[PDB]
Symmetry: D3
Subunit: 175 residues, 6 copies
Amino acid sequence: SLLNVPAGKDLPEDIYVVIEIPANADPIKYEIDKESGALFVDRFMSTAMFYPCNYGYINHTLSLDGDPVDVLVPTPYPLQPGSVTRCRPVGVLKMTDEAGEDAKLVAVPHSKLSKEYDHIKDVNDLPELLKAQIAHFFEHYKDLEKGKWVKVEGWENAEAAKAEIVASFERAKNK
Amino acid sequence: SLLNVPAGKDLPEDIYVVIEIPANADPIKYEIDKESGALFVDRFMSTAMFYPCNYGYINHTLSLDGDPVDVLVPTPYPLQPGSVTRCRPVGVLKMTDEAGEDAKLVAVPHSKLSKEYDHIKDVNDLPELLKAQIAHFFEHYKDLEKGKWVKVEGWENAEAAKAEIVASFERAKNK
Amino acid sequence: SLLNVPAGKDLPEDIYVVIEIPANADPIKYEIDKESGALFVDRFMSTAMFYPCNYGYINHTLSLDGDPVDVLVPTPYPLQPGSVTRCRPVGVLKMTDEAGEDAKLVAVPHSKLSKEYDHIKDVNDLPELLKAQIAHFFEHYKDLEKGKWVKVEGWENAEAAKAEIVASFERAKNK
Amino acid sequence: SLLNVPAGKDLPEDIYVVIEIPANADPIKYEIDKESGALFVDRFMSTAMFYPCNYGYINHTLSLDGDPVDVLVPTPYPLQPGSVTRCRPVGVLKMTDEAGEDAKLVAVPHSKLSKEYDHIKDVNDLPELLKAQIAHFFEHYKDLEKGKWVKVEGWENAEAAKAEIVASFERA
Amino acid sequence: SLLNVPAGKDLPEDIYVVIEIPANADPIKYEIDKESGALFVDRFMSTAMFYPCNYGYINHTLSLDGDPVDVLVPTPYPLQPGSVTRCRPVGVLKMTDEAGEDAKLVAVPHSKLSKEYDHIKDVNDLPELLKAQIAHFFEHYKDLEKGKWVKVEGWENAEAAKAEIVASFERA
Amino acid sequence: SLLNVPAGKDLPEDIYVVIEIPANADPIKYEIDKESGALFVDRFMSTAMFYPCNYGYINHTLSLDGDPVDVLVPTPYPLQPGSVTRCRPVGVLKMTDEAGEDAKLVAVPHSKLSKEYDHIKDVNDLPELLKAQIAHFFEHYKDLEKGKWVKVEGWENAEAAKAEIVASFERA
Ligand SMILES: [Zn+2]
Ligand SMILES: [Zn+2]
Ligand SMILES: [Zn+2]
Ligand SMILES: [Zn+2]
Ligand SMILES: [Zn+2]
Ligand SMILES: [Zn+2]
């Protein structure tokens, strides 16, 4: 059912993000199980931190880590885990962990859901506070997980985010 | 999965309502996507208003607008989006918008879920405050959406609500 | 989708519990519908009580009452109804109601989700307060439901809980 | 501040209830400290129960047990601990406990706050569910506290509640 | 305690707003009782609406209607009723109602609490959505109270808001 | 009201902590204003972190920095800002920051509120997770405030916490 959600109506400008974790929520790290399509509790986060945006993935995408492309979606109110939001990518936070590079895309609600993010075209239009919060969160959220750590390279633009979407959409397509 | 929820055990007295939006919640207007069966964020409501009851639809029904029949369900506590409640229709709020007539049925929890609505047989048994809140909500909730408005005709009885259920159940059945 | 959730990765030490009702929540008694797989509102609980743990079931199990095996899962934060948690059984509360014996297993989050329950190997490792709360809840929660009551026998160990899991997993398997 | 809240505008028909505990809330039993006037955590409730209504007291009253008159107030949404609600008494639940007799008044929001309770004149106009819940709650909430118990004796009417208010206003 | 909160550190550019109602909260209209200083439930709102911002007053001010100056304060998370927020006025919404003229100031968190509102100097720097919501909220929230209404006249600037603060500080 | 809360019933073993911030709550840093006694919004926290325990102070204490003694209190459910909890000190976390040395006491609910913390006699009886979270929280929560930092030095025992309470009680 979540397994049948499209990657988007018009990828990569117009995508759907399947939400796993709300912004500002308790430290329960939910993940959609690939086989069942169900919402699984993956971990109880150990640090006293919360995701600054809603966090989820684009369906029918395959990152180089073997999981779908991760996305953060700011909204005026937290979303329900398992809900799906139509959005437009505007940027991407690049980083490295105990297993190679990682990226966290950022996408904003689509103009048909709200007009309040229309002026966010690219990564520099986003509030600097929000960006600095996101960066800080990912550097530190796994600090108390044994054998796990993260370090942040920096922020890239919407074109780079779209390229990640496309490469991973094409990579999942090709077996 | 929600796609496989019946219209009811004994339509139109005994129906199931698939809940999309809780009573008294943040202004996130969720809708179940017809193809996928998933819970999609349709809009971030622009007015500072909330639904006075839980709001959802009856599955396997086709209104003249092309969507399933909408229903409001009062409960003592807000319900989870994506949950399904067995109820009994008691009434219907008629109205017109930028696209023709619309109706919002009202149904109360079934006696097997709670005895507290048993005395609500027809539309005049409902609290007048609740009715006036519902009417006011629908007149005003789209006031700040461009090219959108609503105006309310009035309240009709349980027989009329059941007729809407039946006509739309039969209309979906017939291709 | 919840219908396709396994009983576990390695039953009966390593099981999945499909959550229906969060700990410390409003008195809405949700149940997963067996046919549809959807989350149904079964009852509005009449007593002013809440479940001391999250409450759910193990999929692909058949108790002697005809329903899957019920499980309580303590967590540091309440879980979302419809989510799935990997856990390890440590005990079981035995009791009788208006229809024969019943058991409520207790299982703790699996070590891959959290290290905080690792020291809970068997039923006596659980906080005595929590146990006494669970026992009291089940004795009294149906006190105001007509023709319904419950009485508690006592607590049995992890081996007994695992035997219930196995017997009901094998019972569902065999038509 | 809470120390200076009136017992009421026109006692006993028109009173103020200082709220200590919301309806449907976590099992934290707050109580206003008499000396300071501050909101104290009195207990973490041991049973997995919640108060069916908001719970508090009428200021400037003293019951036989030396504490102010206790009151339950139903509202359409839970109230903030430390807030003060204008209400109209309608009933009283009589009980005994480990310390002896006890009484809990029930009062509904005053007509100037809401019309929704205008029809509740007396104890029997309250919903049967809510009454049954309250009785059950008080019967069982101390079940897991050693040496503490409650036996509910019964309900009494709005005249009975008003009489308690007056008598306890005078006692203070 | 709330009775002893200053009007501000450096009125009218630097003020304190006592909060009565959170943004996005249940429809319970609290109001600080002038005599006691306690948080009273004034009304259960009849329309299914919520305040777009936190709402409260500046202490030691008196408006022509005999009540203190009312203020809306946007914050990134809702504030607790009875809490006090240091802010900077930026605007005012002018309206009339069943009692006559009314004005609601808007003030943003002071730079020492957050940098997020530094760029809001004047009424037109506020988001157009939020302004439209506030106006709509005040236009309609009393629609289901008999004999009560509001017509919004318009917005005025930060100088206008400051002038109201000063004048009302003096009136008290 | 909060100004008149005792330091404790039997300091330093039996104290009262005035709560400013709940465990697991939105990133709003409230602080009781010393002059008024009212709950002020001191800051909107910039990092996406939450306090692992409820946080507050002991009234009628003064630390070397001129502010009252700070205390963390774990509870099974979060407490209301402005509420007062009877607890028993067990430990203290020592740190330094942009202003110099700092210390945060840890105290657990008193046995009359709950038996759940009776077994916690001293710093090492606290759960290792909670201790690690607290340390991490204080290490990082000011990471996005310019010119503000914390380096955690270490934990000290229940005797050390009691000594701080006494010394700071005397300083006031
Ligand atoms: Zn939260
Ligand atoms: Zn709400
Ligand atoms: Zn709850
Ligand atoms: Zn609650
Ligand atoms: Zn809300
Ligand atoms: Zn929280």
